[PDB]
């Protein structure tokens, strides 16, 4: 033929069949032992998610949400993702004492449901009403963005203490139980309005620590609705929403490390 005879062509096939078969069987074996060394409830390493990311619902083309108020299908793209998220926080999804629980309607302290063990059933998560998100189809004019803190197993988000000076200096400082979120731009051509649990501009600490998908399915993380009823129009406004805390940090590279990058433009 090309290389060899039929007899040789066969033998080279019988070899590579057994050979690659063995190699596949060995590869699988090493994957088995790897998995055997891992927990079902907690990942081996967590230093790469460490400082929590802050992500929002409006799916930004490039950290930007520009549209026209005087146009219907101009914002119907951002309403798709906005709906996708809030559709999960339905009351019909949170039914019965299992696996949900009614928690303080005001920001409270942490809740420990034991260890990362299966020695108990599904760890009961705090309910969250999308109805706590006042004012927010969504904002056809002047968007109503929804913030979110990235989930990390066993992470206890710790707010800053009012020992020294603060950006939003001491205003509504629920020091003990709220992780604040203050959006900014100089360039003050807007109108910041925050909505959340208990009416505070933060995340209620009663939703922590997260026990993971395996030990807490259907779990709901707290949301923080933000509305920009800015009196300006037809210009790119670089708005940055920042979260503050002891376990919260940022990076010049990762522009989502505990903060937002939104470029709103109501070009109408």
């Amino acid at each position: 033929f090309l290389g060899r005879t039929g007899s040789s062509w066969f033998k080279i096939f019988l070899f590579y069949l057994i050979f690659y078969g063995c190699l596949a069987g060995i590869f699988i074996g090493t994957i088995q032992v790897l998995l055997l060394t891992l927990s079902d409830f907690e990942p081996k390493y967590q230093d790469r998610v460490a400082p929590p990311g802050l992500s929002h619902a409006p799916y930004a083309i490039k950290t930007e949400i520009s549209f026209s108020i005087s146009n219907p299908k101009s914002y119907e793209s951002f309403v798709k993702s906005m709906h996708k998220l809030m559709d999960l926080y339905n009351e019909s999804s949170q039914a019965g004492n299992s696996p949900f629980e009614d928690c303080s309607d005001t920001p409270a302290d942490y809740i420990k449901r034991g260890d990362l063990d299966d020695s108990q059933g599904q760890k009961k998560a705090c309910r969250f009403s999308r109805m706590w998100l006042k004012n927010c189809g969504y904002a056809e004019g002047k968007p109503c963005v929804v913030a979110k803190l990235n989930r990390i197993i066993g992470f206890y988000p710790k707010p800053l203490k009012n020992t020294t000076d603060l950006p939003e200096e001491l205003q509504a400082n629920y020091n003990q139980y709220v992780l604040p979120l203050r959006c900014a731009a100089r360039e003050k051509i807007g109108s910041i309005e925050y909505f959340g649990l208990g009416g505070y501009a933060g995340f209620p600490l009663q939703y922590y620590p997260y026990y993971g998908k395996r030990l807490q399915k259907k779990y709901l993380q707290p949301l923080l609705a933000i509305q920009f009823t800015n009196l300006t129009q037809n210009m790119e406004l670089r708005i940055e929403c920042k979260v503050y805390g002891e376990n919260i940090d940022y990076s010049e590279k990762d522009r989502f490390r505990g903060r937002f990058e939104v470029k709103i433009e109501v070009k109408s």
Binding site: K11, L34, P43, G53, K148, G212, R214, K253, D254, F256
Partner: protein
């Protein structure tokens, strides 16, 4: 074009002096007119040689920039700029990826260009050396007056004059001469002075006395002649053009390189476009379809391989430089290993090029002297009183002297003023009797008759050094038979005795044997003149026989020859044991050529020519079956009337071939004949008459000390110490580097698979990219470099000089067996070890292997800063990318770890590491430096930006260890099978 120049020349030495003048419109006495000479100048053109048109270095450099790998790397470099252009227009990408990768790849092409350019070097100044043989000026007779003119202004027809010490300015017809002798070594390779006279003495113009040639010099006397040829039209000017004009051609090693380039280029374009369409079918945007292709290019092309080859060659050439063997062309480092036929000059190559005493006949006994340079033999006789009598004649009846200031150099190597035979005798006595000058001071010469054409003897009368005599001793030497007709007694073991027919017959026997050995034989005799008949003041007349020259006492015979170099016989046998055919090709006479052939082992004992059979059986040569003769001796005059097909039959039908009295073109023809049969041929030589053959040879080797400038220009290799044993070393080195290149190539190729497979699974699996493009270049250009080079220092696995020369048609540098092992077996194991570490990194950070399938869409989505892992955690864009790049880093390090084992297995093709050992210090160096480089690239701060290399946790380093070990075991088991059964299965499938 040069087929005309490969033919024997035609001449006009047969014409009379007068007749020759009519042909050139010339005067025998007055010479040309100033006006007629200038007319002929403009007519024929200058008496000069024009160098052939060369290829500029520009075109030579750029021709390498387009050879398979460079072509693919160019397509990659441009395709980078393509994707970059498409980006800069569509979505403003502030990145530098495609732009920088395009710059990097273009640089890789340029630098790789320098390496191949350095390897494909051609240092040739043939025509320049020939031009150096034309004198600046010549002496001509114009308008009846002699004047010096620019030799280029010399034309056919003018009257030229030459004298001892000057170069022949052009081909001349001798019309007048006085004691003129010439050095025709340019045409023959033999430096013994040849007389020139107006008389025609041979039909063959290269042998007649009435022609003098350009490229030669007058050694003594004076001559006048008419110019018959000028410039390019001279006999050796044509040889110049032939030699300088010959197409170089591709080396065996070069052909091998291009061959695997085709193979690897083939699989590259195959998988390249095979997966380019496979991606579009899967619905991949052309934006991405090209990005994957660039990666495929980089994965398939072994970026550092061609440069490795060059370095391995260079390092092999450095070792040979250290044995006095200079390599002018890097590729010639290997040709000697692939050589199946050596065509060797005799004089100054196989031989020392110096008349040396070989045997002596005295006391009715043949004695042998030591002919070797360094005198590696033993003594023959010292005791016999006869010896001292013969020794005295050899010293006394000798007019040769050592040049001043030689006392530093060895006797046999020092320059001597005199003819070759007298120098030989001088050096013979000086060696075994001490200072000859002393013997010539103790015995003052009073009268002598120098060797005469008519007398055929030379005699001398000396004052006997003996005090009790202080009388007159007569000594003489000459033609053995002439000396015999002048002897009455023979000095036997001390005492004289009558010359009976018995001893006279033993003389003839001794004389015939020595002459049969191709040796020049001389007779020696002396006579103690009677005291009473010769007073202490008796005057001797040299002009008229004033003393007896008959009834003298015969002392002995001495024989001499230009002997082989000490190492030559043994080197010839070694070449022949390695299955190399050795042919002699010489301008010298057949009797001498044949005798040295037997001396060095070109013709082995018992082997006969058709002429030998005929003489032994006493029958006509036509009655001899030529197939009964494995040896042959072909004279150039017969070679001339043979067609190439008939030359091919001679080459095919004889194992032991001697081509004697060959011209320079004839040497070229013999070389081409050998090549025509498909053989790789080496030429060894030292003369300008070797230049065409040296050029045409696959590898020409010139002698460094004895070699002429031309020969060393025409060669690929120079033996700087004239050590012929270096050929044996060269062939051995050549074979070793050929095997080691295979090892180094397999090693380099093996790591291509773990660079290809990640890109494929990236498409077919939709997982995060396991390894990056930049990461690949860190391997092929970084870590693999020193290890790959180090394989050039591997010792032989067996006695390589015991095997036959490779068949260049069947035995390739890269074959299917190499690809099967490198791509199908070992590289495949490396790929898995890479993937394993990849799955380990991701799974330990929260992305278990199961959830990875079909996630790249969301993984690469820059706007999704919340991807969910297996444990329910959310990752931003840059966070997961850090883990991904950490995966690139550990996959990279996995390659390094699996290359550890590969380096050790590529060490040997057959033998076990437990047999070959670990005595390669460069290889071990490679292991340490490779690992140091990898660690540095991972842990050095800032490398995460420039190369996207991230720090690895200690446990990460050990992921591929079990795969590294399986490689070592697998290959060790496999080679154990090879050795345990030379049959073929494992052998014919995987044996590189």
């Amino acid at each position: 074009l040069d087929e005309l120049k490969k033919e024997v020349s035609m001449d006009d030495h047969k014409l009379s002096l007068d007749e020759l003048h009519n042909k050139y419109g010339t005067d025998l006495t007055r010479g040309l007119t100033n006006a007629r000479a200038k007319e002929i100048l403009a007519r024929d053109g200058p008496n000069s040689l024009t160098p052939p048109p060369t290829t500029p270095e520009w075109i030579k450099f750029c021709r390498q920039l387009f050879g398979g790998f460079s072509i693919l790397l160019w397509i990659g470099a441009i395709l980078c700029f393509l994707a970059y252009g498409i980006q800069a227009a569509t979505e403003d990408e502030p990145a530098n990826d495609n732009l920088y990768l395009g710059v990097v790849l273009s640089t890789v092409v340029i630098v790789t260009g320098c390496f191949s350019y350095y390897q494909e070097a051609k240092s040739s100044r043939i025509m320049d050396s020939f031009k150096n043989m034309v004198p600046q000026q010549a002496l001509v007779i114009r308008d009846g007056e002699k004047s010096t003119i620019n030799a280029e202004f010399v034309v056919a027809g003018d009257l030229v004059e030459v004298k001892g010490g000057d170069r022949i300015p052009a081909d001349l017809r001798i019309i007048s001469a006085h004691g003129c002798k010439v050095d025709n070594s340019s045409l023959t390779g033999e430096s013994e002075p040849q007389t020139r006279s107006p008389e025609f003495s041979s039909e063959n113009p290269l042998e007649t006395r009435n022609i003098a040639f350009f490229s030669t010099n007058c050694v003594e006397g004076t001559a006048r002649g008419v110019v018959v040829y000028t410039g390019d039209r001279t006999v050796m000017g044509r040889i110049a053009t032939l030699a300088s004009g010959l197409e170089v051609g591709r080396t065996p090693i070069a052909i091998e390189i291009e061959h695997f380039i085709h193979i690897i280029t083939g699989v590259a374009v195959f998988l390249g476009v095979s997966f380019f369409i496979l991606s579009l079918i899967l619905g991949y945007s052309w934006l991405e379809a090209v990005i994957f292709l660039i990666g495929i290019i980089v994965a398939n092309v072994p970026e550092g391989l061609l440069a490795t080859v060059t370095v391995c060659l260079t390092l092999t050439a450095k070792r040979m430089a250290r044995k006095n063997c200079l390599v002018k062309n890097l590729e010639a480092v290997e040709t000697l290993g692939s050589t199946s036929t050596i065509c060797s000059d005799k004089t100054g190559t196989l031989t020392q090029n110096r008349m040396t005493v070989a045997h002596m006949w005295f006391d009715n006994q043949i004695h042998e002297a030591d002919t070797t340079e360094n005198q590696s033999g033993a003594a023959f006789d010292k005791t016999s009183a006869t010896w001292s009598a013969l020794s005295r004649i050899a010293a006394l009846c000798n007019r040769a002297v050592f040049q001043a200031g030689q006392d530093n150099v060895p006797i046999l190597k020092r320059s001597v003023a005199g003819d070759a035979s007298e120098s030989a005798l001088l050096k013979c006595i000086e060696l075994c009797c001490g200072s000859v000058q002393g013997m010539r001071d103790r015995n003052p010469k009073i009268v002598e008759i120098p060797f005469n054409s008519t007398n055929k003897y030379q005699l001398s009368i000396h004052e006997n050094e003996k005090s009790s005599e202080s009388r007159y001793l007569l000594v003489m030497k000459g033609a053995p038979e002439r000396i015999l007709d002048r002897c009455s007694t023979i000095l036997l073991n001390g005492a004289e005795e009558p010359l009976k027919e018995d001893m006279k017959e033993a003389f003839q026997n001794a004389y015939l044997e020595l002459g049969g050995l191709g040796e020049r034989v001389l007779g020696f005799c002396h006579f103690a003149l009677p005291e009473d008949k010769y007073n202490e003041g008796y005057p001797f007349d040299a002009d008229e026989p004033n003393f007896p020259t008959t009834d003298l006492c015969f002392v002995g015979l001495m024989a001499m020859i230009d002997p082989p170099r000490a190492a030559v016989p043994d080197a010839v046998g070694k070449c022949r044991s390695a299955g190399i055919k050795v042919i002699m090709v010489t301008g010298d006479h057949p009797i001498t050529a044949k005798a040295i052939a037997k001396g060095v082992g070109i013709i082995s004992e018992g082997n006969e020519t058709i002429e030998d059979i005929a003489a032994r059986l006493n029958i006509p040569i036509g009655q001899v079956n030529p197939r009964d003769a494995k040896a042959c001796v072909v004279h150039g005059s017969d070679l001339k009337d043979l067609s190439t097909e008939v030359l091919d039959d001679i080459l095919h039908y004889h194992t032991e071939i001697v081509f004697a009295r060959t011209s320079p073109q004839q040497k070229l023809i013999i070389v081409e004949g050998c090549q025509r049969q498909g053989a790789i041929v080496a030429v060894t030589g030292d003369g300008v008459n070797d230049s065409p053959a040296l050029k045409k040879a696959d590898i020409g080797v010139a002698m460094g000390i004895s070699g002429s400038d031309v020969s060393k220009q025409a060669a690929d290799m120079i033996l700087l110490d004239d050590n012929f044993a270096s050929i044996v070393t060269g062939v051995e080195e050549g074979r070793l580097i050929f095997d080691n290149l295979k090892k180094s190539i397999a090693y380099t190729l093996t790591s291509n698979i773990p660079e290809i497979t990640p890109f494929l699974v990236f498409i077919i699996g939709n997982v995060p990219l396991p390894l990056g493009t930049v990461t690949i270049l860190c391997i092929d250009l970084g870590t693999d470099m020193v290890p790959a080079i180090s394989l050039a220092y591997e010792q032989a696995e067996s006695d390589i000089m015991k095997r036959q020369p490779r068949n260049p048609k069947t035995d390739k540098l890269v074959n299917e067996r190499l690809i099967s092992m490198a791509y199908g077996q070992i590289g495949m194991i490396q790929a898995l070890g890479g993937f394993f570490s990849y799955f380990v990194i991701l799974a330990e950070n929260g992305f278990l292997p199961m959830d990875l399938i079909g996630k790249r869409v969301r993984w690469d989505d820059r706007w999704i800063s919340d991807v969910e892992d297996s444990f329910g955690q959310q990752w931003t864009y840059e966070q997961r990318k850090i883990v991904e790049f950490t995966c690139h880093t550990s996959f990279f390090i996995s390659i390094v770890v699996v290359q550890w084992a590969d380096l050790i297995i590529c060490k040997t093709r057959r033998n076990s590491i437990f047999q070959q050992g670990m005595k390669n210090k460069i290889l071990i160096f490679g292991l340490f430096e490779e690992t140091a480089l990898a660690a540095f690239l991972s842990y050095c701060p800032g490398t995460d930006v420039a190369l996207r290399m991230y720090p690895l946790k200690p446990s990460w380093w050990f992921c591929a260890f079990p795969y590294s070990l399986i490689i070592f075991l697998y290959d060790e088991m496999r080679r154990f099978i090879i050795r345990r059964s030379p049959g073929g299965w494992v052998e014919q499938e995987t044996y590189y």
